């Protein structure tokens, strides 16, 4: 039954090629049979395609070059990191509606209201050792590490406007990083950012700090951060 | 909903936490707050105490019917830390077996399909979990899982006989090495699903999407089908239902089936229709079938007093 | 005093918060949840709950509220399902699977032609029923046309026939609420009971019709061509120059019908639209008819009528939605709604069965939902049935998971009324060997009876000598059916006609063999031990050489004694009893009796046979009338040495040793 159901979206396919029709994606007929199976790991699985190959094709001659290129591997990494903080999101969306007496989701929506209630679930005690104060009672490398896995970038600016005064000069980085369309540090602010790493962030006893600021810096590239990043 | 069936005056004196039906639904057990468990030998109408068994020092939280190959035995758990084993032999009901391993209250008690021979599960608010067996010659063996809940064990339900490979040829004397599986449900939110392997239980899969303490936990019966199904029941007033469709895989999908505004106490499978029984702190029954688009539907709301 | 104060048995009415801040102290959760009740379901309907002079627990049976009493009807079906099954023979769990895919339409389609005949009375129970194997027939028919081809068939023909099948069926499901309208609409009118006429033709009739009131228009066109492309042509024209400005009201709908437009925006602004006031079907067969060529496809008409109730970016939706034939009256008020109501909703049926006439992808997860055919989702029945036709019809599609779950479904449905076989031939046929062992076992321990009755026997008979199901298996169900609670009696027998190598040795032992010695009952004794006793049997049995010896043995003994005795005391078997005998004593010398009764029955026993074997010998070694009265000089060192080894009581046992003793001694004296 499965391989019957693809099998009319290649005949589709294959008749508008034929017809000379604007050629459809062949992704979005392939989605649209993994649907009609009801299997959630095949539908996750071409949600998974769909965003992957959401990416500038260049009538290239050669297929290799184009795939190799820096532009084209960039756009592949900017569509992995997409796929993996709307999976983030919407986990954390279920995770919270499933918990929704402990959450204390309130009434505002958002990414950063959202990421609060989440924080009552994953952070029912408060771990010794966190730095840089607090937020209304929650956080603040938790709060920004959170809604910079969830992708909301603007959520977590938000913190850093909130915790503009223990925080210092991460904001400016911070700043920089969120206006550049490739989520990068201009090279003099990276380079300031990875000395500072060194020196003071990578014997901070806040996992969550040393999380974001090796993601932010691209560096400690060996650390796996497994007090934050389980799975 | 359905046609008005006999009424039985129990003569009790407090709440009956649980009640079960023997296998051939000629007898009914009951326990309470009261420390007893009686039994009720209602056929063809006719309600009739046939014992009131007292051993507890606390109250009964749960009661089950062995399989009746092994004749008529019934297991209680208490608050009081102990599981009685009761036998009748004769028309007269005794006390043959006496369990007080537990450090605290035994929440629920469960027996095993009766291929994997005469087992009982008992789950303990001490967090661990005690599997009972009789052999047949000398006293009770017992296998305690330590720690096996963080706070405390609500519910333990045993997983349906299956032989594995049963469409596969095989000799016309052999014996058929199960697959013994439970679920249990508890206080950590969790329901754990156990395996025996080389004679000892180990955890084999932790289930997580209850955000409060699980209440109970239900393995489907067997309707022939690969898919195995469970319930599970929470103070967070959520019931799921996971379902497995390759015992391979070992992959475990949660689906909502409802969120209630109260506590959610028991659930109980259906033996033929695959329905769910829901008790909820609402004081109904809610009954709940799914449809073939896989939707779950509420087939039945029956309250305290239509009758 | 003799009075009472006077119990309050309520589970308290609605004190609840206090406990409850109680509660929310989380230090303790298991005695705030006593409160309620941890009660679930037992199988066959069995419902456990508690809830509500006295207060306590009600305990209400709860099997189906609907449809209990109507069983005539699916006999008839059932058994005309099952004369039209066939039977798979190569494993211990047979297999059924429906004769190849042909002759169930015209079954079903028969089958309620007999229905048809006391179908009156009932209303609205087959209607439906009867609308959906009709249009199955119609589409796949695909059966018998009175030699649908004589001779070949032609595709053209072919699907021309099926356009005259299908048309009859649409005048069919027309012809009795027409008869309705023509009986309400009184004299005339030709801008409606004209146009409800054309909704289902007869036109035989309609031009009688048009005697009284009807125009010339019609009584002369009562097949062209493009003729009527020029009635459109005309009709474009008075519209390019506004020539029908003035004209008669729907007389127009009625013109532009023999003109297929079907919806039109006149001069004025009016949207003329022909289809309203119309069912989904007979707005199909308009398109079919009057807005297409005299000669096309199906598929094709089903995807332009489903691009009509489907809207477009220029034009109203001028179909009506195919709804189920009961929600019809509650349209959802599509109010600034339409499209995310309608990814919601069922369609009946015969589109459905439409669609698999023209193509092989749709789903068959939709097209089984029971709450097409009526709303209440447990009985399937039409389901069950029609699953089975489109797999004759080809079709594997549905997964394993739905076949299981709609067997089992129907299979606790035809128990929720109290069956029996026809749900053994309906899990017969499914694909999984064990599954179909395990559930027809387990199925058997719940429902075979202990009484052995016509109504028992009917049953059993049904299953051995029609669904191929044992007598062994029965019987041992009938043991199950006993120890669980009895007997003593009927679980003997029933297990007998079953071999227990082991334990039917055990059991008979540890209990019938005592009391049949009492009793001396030993011929009933005799079966199971005689059968057990076989050269086959004798291999595999525990125990086996000990007991069985000991047993046939003692009760052999009686017989042959007593019998040769008489007879002539032929010498030869002398010898063989002499010689089991003699081996006797030392294997009655090991008895374990492990338990009470246990040592009880081994005394009986030696007692009896004692007693026995005394009167025997009473006339045993030769009575000597020629010698000196038969003098026992001869002693046998062989029964003083069984004896020794012989182990019973110290009391009775010894005494009687003792006695042996003296017997010895005097037989001593006499020989010194």
Not at chain 1, 182 to 193: C, H, M, Q
Not at chain 3, 284 to 312: C, D, G, K, N, S
Request: charged share 25%.
């Amino acid at each position: 039954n499965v391989e019957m159901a693809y099998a009319r979206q290649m005949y589709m396919y294959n008749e508008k090629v034929v017809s000379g029709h604007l050629q459809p994606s062949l992704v979005d007929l392939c989605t649209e049979a993994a649907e009609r199976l009801d299997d959630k790991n095949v539908s996750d699985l071409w949600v998974m395609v769909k965003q992957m190959t959401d990416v500038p094709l260049i009538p290239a001659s050669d297929t290799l070059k184009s795939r190799c290129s820096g532009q084209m591997q960039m756009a592949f990494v900017r569509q992995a990191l997409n796929y993996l903080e709307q999976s983030y999101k919407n986990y954390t969306l279920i995770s919270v509606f499933a918990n929704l007496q402990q959450a204390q989701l309130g009434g505002v929506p958002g990414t950063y209201n959202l990421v609060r209630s989440f924080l009552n679930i994953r952070l029912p005690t408060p771990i010794p050792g966190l730095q840089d104060g607090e937020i209304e009672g929650y956080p603040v490398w938790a709060l920004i590490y959170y809604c910079m896995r969830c992708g909301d970038l603007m959520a977590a600016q938000q913190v850093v406007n909130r915790a503009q005064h223990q925080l210092g000069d991460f904001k400016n980085c911070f700043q920089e990083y969120i206006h550049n369309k490739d989520r990068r540090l201009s090279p003099t602010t990276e380079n300031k950012l990875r000395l500072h790493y060194r020196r003071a962030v990578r014997a901070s006893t806040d996992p969550y700090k040393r999380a974001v600021y090796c993601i932010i810096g691209r560096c400690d590239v060996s650390d796996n951060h497994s007090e934050v990043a389980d799975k | 909903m359905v046609s008005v069936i006999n009424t039985v005056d129990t003569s009790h004196e407090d709440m009956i936490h649980d009640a079960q039906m023997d296998y051939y639904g000629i007898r009914l057990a009951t326990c309470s707050s009261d420390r007893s468990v009686k039994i009720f030998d209602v056929k063809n109408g006719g309600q009739i105490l046939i014992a009131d068994l007292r051993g507890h020092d606390g109250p009964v939280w749960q009661v089950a019917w062995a399989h009746p190959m092994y004749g008529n035995i019934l297991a209680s758990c208490s608050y009081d830390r102990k599981v009685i084993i009761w036998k009748e032999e004769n028309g007269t009901w005794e006390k043959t077996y006496e369990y007080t391993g537990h450090d605290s209250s035994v929440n629920s008690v469960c027996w095993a399909p009766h291929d994997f021979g005469l087992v009982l599960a008992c789950g303990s608010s001490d967090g661990a979990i005690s599997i009972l067996t009789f052999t047949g010659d000398g006293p009770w063996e017992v296998k305690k899982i330590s720690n096996a809940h963080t706070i405390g064990c609500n519910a333990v339900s045993w997983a349906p006989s299956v032989i594995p490979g049963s469409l596969v040829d095989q000799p016309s004397s052999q014996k058929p090495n199960y697959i013994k599986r439970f679920v249990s449900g508890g206080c950590d939110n969790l329901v754990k699903i156990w395996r025996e392997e080389d004679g000892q239980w180990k955890e084999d899969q932790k289930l997580e999407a209850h955000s409060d303490w699980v209440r109970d936990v239900a393995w489907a019966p067997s309707i022939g089908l690969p898919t195995s199904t469970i319930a599970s029941c929470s103070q967070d007033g959520r019931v799921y239902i996971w379902t497995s469709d390759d015992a391979a895989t070992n992959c475990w999908t949660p689906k909502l089936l409802h969120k209630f505004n109260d506590v959610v106490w028991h659930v109980s499978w259906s033996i033929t229709a695959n329905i769910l029984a829901v008790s909820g702190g609402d004081n109904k029954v809610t009954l709940w079938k799914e449809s073939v688009d896989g939707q779950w539907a509420c087939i039945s709301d029956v309250n305290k007093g239509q009758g | 005093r003799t009075v009472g104060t006077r119990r309050q048995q309520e589970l308290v009415p609605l004190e609840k918060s206090v406990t409850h801040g109680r509660g929310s102290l989380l230090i303790d959760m298991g005695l705030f949840m006593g409160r309620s009740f941890r009660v679930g379901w037992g199988p066959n309907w069995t419902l456990v709950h508690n809830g509500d002079s006295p207060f306590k627990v009600h305990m209400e049976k709860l099997s189906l509220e609907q449809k209990s009493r109507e069983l005539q009807s699916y006999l008839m079906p059932l058994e005309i399902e099952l004369k039209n099954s066939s039977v798979d023979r190569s494993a211990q769990c047979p297999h059924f699977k429906p004769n190849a895919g042909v002759a169930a339409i015209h079954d079903y389609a028969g089958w309620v032609r007999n229905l048809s005949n006391e179908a009156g009375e009932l209303e609205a129970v087959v209607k439906q029923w009867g609308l959906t194997w009709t249009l199955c027939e119609s589409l796949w028919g695909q059966l018998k046309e009175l030699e649908a081809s004589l001779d070949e068939p032609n595709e053209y023909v072919r699907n021309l026939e099926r356009r005259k099948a299908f048309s009859h069926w649409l005048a069919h499901t027309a012809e009795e609420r027409i008869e309705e309208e023509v009986s309400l609409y009184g004299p005339e009118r030709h801008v409606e009971a004209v146009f409800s006429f054309l909704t289902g033709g007869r036109i035989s009739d309609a031009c009688r019709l048009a005697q009284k009131s009807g125009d010339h228009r019609l009584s002369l066109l009562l097949g062209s061509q493009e003729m009527r492309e020029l009635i459109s042509l005309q009709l474009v024209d008075w519209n390019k120059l506004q020539v029908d400005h003035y004209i008669q009201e729907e007389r127009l709908r009625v013109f532009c019908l023999l003109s297929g437009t079907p919806v039109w925006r006149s001069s004025d602004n009016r949207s003329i639209n022909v289809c309203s006031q119309l069912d989904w079907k007979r707005t199909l067969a308009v398109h079919l008819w009057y807005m297409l060529p005299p000669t096309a496809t199906i598929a094709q008409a089903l995807r332009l009528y489903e691009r009509a109730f489907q809207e477009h970016e220029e034009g109203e939706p001028y179909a009506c939605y195919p709804l189920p034939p009961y929600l019809e009256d509650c349209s959802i008020s599509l109010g600034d709604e339409p499209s995310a109501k309608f990814s919601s909703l069922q369609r009946d049926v015969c589109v459905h069965l439409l669609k698999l006439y023209s193509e092989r992808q749709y789903d068959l997860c939709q097209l089984l939902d029971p709450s097409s055919v009526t709303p209440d989702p447990l009985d399937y029945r039409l389901s069950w049935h029609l699953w089975m036709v489109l797999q004759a019809l080809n079709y594997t599609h549905l997964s394993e998971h739905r076949q299981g779950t709609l067997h089992a479904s129907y299979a606790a449905q035809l128990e929720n009324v109290g069956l029996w076989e026809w749900a053994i031939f309906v899990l017969l046929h499914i694909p999984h060997p064990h599954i179909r062992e395990a559930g027809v076992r387990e199925l058997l321990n719940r429902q075979c009876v202990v009484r052995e009755s016509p109504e028992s026997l009917a049953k059993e008979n049904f299953l051995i000598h029609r669904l191929c199901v044992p007598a062994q298996w029965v019987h041992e169900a009938k043991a199950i059916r006993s120890r669980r609670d009895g007997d003593r009696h009927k679980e003997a027998l029933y297990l007998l006609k079953g071999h227990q190598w082991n334990p039917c040795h055990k059991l008979v032992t540890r209990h019938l063999a005592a009391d049949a010695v009492i009793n001396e009952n030993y011929r009933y004794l005799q079966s199971f031990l005689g059968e057990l006793s076989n050269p086959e049997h004798c291999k595999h049995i525990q125990d086996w050489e000990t007991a069985g010896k000991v047993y046939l043995d003692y009760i052999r003994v009686i017989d042959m004694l007593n019998l040769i005795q008489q007879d002539e005391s032929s010498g030869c078997e002398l010898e063989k009893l002499h010689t089991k005998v003699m081996s006797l004593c030392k294997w009655v010398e090991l008895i374990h009796c492990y338990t009470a009764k246990d040592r009880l029955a081994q005394s009986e026993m030696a007692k009896r046979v004692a007693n026995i074997l005394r009167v025997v010998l009473s006339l045993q070694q030769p009575p000597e009338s020629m010698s000196d009265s038969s003098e026992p000089r001869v002693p046998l060192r062989l029964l003083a040495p069984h004896i020794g080894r012989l182990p019973m009581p110290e009391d009775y046992a010894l005494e009687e040793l003792r006695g042996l003793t003296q017997s010895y001694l005097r037989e001593l004296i006499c020989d010194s």
